[PDB]
Design an enzyme around this catalytic site. Structure first.
Site, PDB file in Angstrom:
ATOM      1  CG  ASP A  34     -42.474  -3.341 -17.376  1.00  0.00           C
ATOM      2  OD1 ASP A  34     -42.295  -4.472 -16.950  1.00  0.00           O
ATOM      3  OD2 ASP A  34     -43.301  -2.915 -17.829  1.00  0.00           O
ATOM      4  CB  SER A  69     -38.859 -22.910 -14.874  1.00  0.00           C
ATOM      5  OG  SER A  69     -38.515 -23.493 -13.747  1.00  0.00           O
TER       6      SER A  69
END
Length: 330
Positions: free
Chosen positions: A35, A199
């Protein structure tokens, strides 16, 4: 040193991936959920409330000659999906795919919430976010990667998750045969303890690319792709019959519909998520309504590039003094 381990989807939808981890002496092998959105290595154990264990493999510290109680230490964590667990702490030897850390904090669960009990395939979590998020008290503990870092050939690990197939976690090296083209690296903020990056935009199917900054985290422990409602609406508007269902808790679509791809930007580079990756199947057995793999982050408080996005790429988690993230197509 290096390590290399195969990671395997827990079910036919890629709801999560499990990776075998050797703990203790003699080795006890547990299948953990790696994770990159959390920083605790915790396991089902001999100390876990009996009624809360249902098929998981447990760690038994008393059977490990290298286990040592971390005296006075406790831990307690809650995850974004509302699940939680808590307990005490041992240090022990932990190996992943040939790479060994001695003195790793292994957080033994006394209590786990129902969603963990109900998932027989996940024996615990191995956190790979920054150690600043580790919940051990009074002395915060280091992640497996943080402990291994100085010994690694290169201070990196990579995630190469498969679509409906196994993939690979590598530690200490970049496998240049595992991706196409070049790796584009992008800046990371560690201020929230995550692999947080921005992004450069998105496209829906064959549509034109929209240049826009989307701050989010690279999170192997989250199944889906969670993005701003504007972005998500623009995606599902291209799917005939798709709608946001408050009763279901997100966007659904008829399985007879064709899903467009979704492209996200990494610098000037582009990662294309194929439409099939965005199908998470019937909302209930026999239903003609399918659950979408791109959902709104509104009310999460952060955008999450979860497995839907990451499995479309070869991802480098670069733990150099100034961390960065790399993405390649594959």
């Amino acid at each position: 040193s290096t390590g290399s381990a195969t990671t395997t989807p827990i079910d036919s939808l890629d709801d999560a991936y499990i990776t075998p981890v050797q703990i203790g002496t003699p080795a006890q092998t547990l299948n953990l959920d790696f994770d990159t959105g959390s920083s605790d290595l915790w396991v089902f154990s001999s100390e876990t409330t009996a009624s809360e264990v249902d098929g998981q493999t447990i760690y038994t510290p008393s059977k490990s000659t290298t286990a040592k109680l971390l005296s006075g230490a406790t831990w307690s964590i809650s995850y974004g999906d509302g699940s939680s667990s808590s307990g005490d702490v041992y240090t022990d030897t932990v190996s992943v795919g040939g790479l060994t850390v001695t003195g790793q904090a292994v957080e033994s669960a006394k209590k786990v919430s129902s969603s963990f009990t109900e998932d027989s395939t996940i024996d615990g979590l191995l956190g790979l976010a920054f150690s600043t998020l580790n919940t051990v008290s009074p002395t915060q503990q280091k992640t497996f990667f943080d402990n291994a870092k100085a010994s690694l050939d290169s201070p990196v690990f990579t995630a190469d998750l498969g679509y409906h197939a196994p993939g690979t976690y590598n530690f200490g090296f970049i496998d240049t045969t595992a991706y196409t083209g070049s790796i584009t690296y992008t800046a990371v903020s560690t201020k929230q303890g995550f692999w947080e990056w921005t992004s450069t935009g998105y496209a829906v199917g064959s549509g034109t690319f929209k240049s826009t900054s989307i701050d989010g985290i690279a999170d192997t422990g989250t199944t889906l792709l969670y993005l701003p409602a504007t972005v998500v609406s623009a995606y599902w508007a291209q799917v005939s019959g798709a709608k946001s269902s408050s009763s279901v808790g997100g966007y659904v679509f008829p399985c007879s519909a064709t899903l467009p791809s979704f492209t996200f930007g990494v610098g000037s580079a582009r990662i294309v998520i194929p439409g099939d990756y965005i199908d998470f199947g019937p909302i209930s057995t026999g239903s003609s309504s399918c659950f979408g793999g791109i959902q709104s982050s509104a009310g999460i408080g952060i955008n999450i590039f979860g497995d839907v996005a990451l499995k479309a790429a070869f991802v480098v988690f670069n733990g150099a003094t100034t961390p960065t993230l790399g993405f390649a197509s594959k």
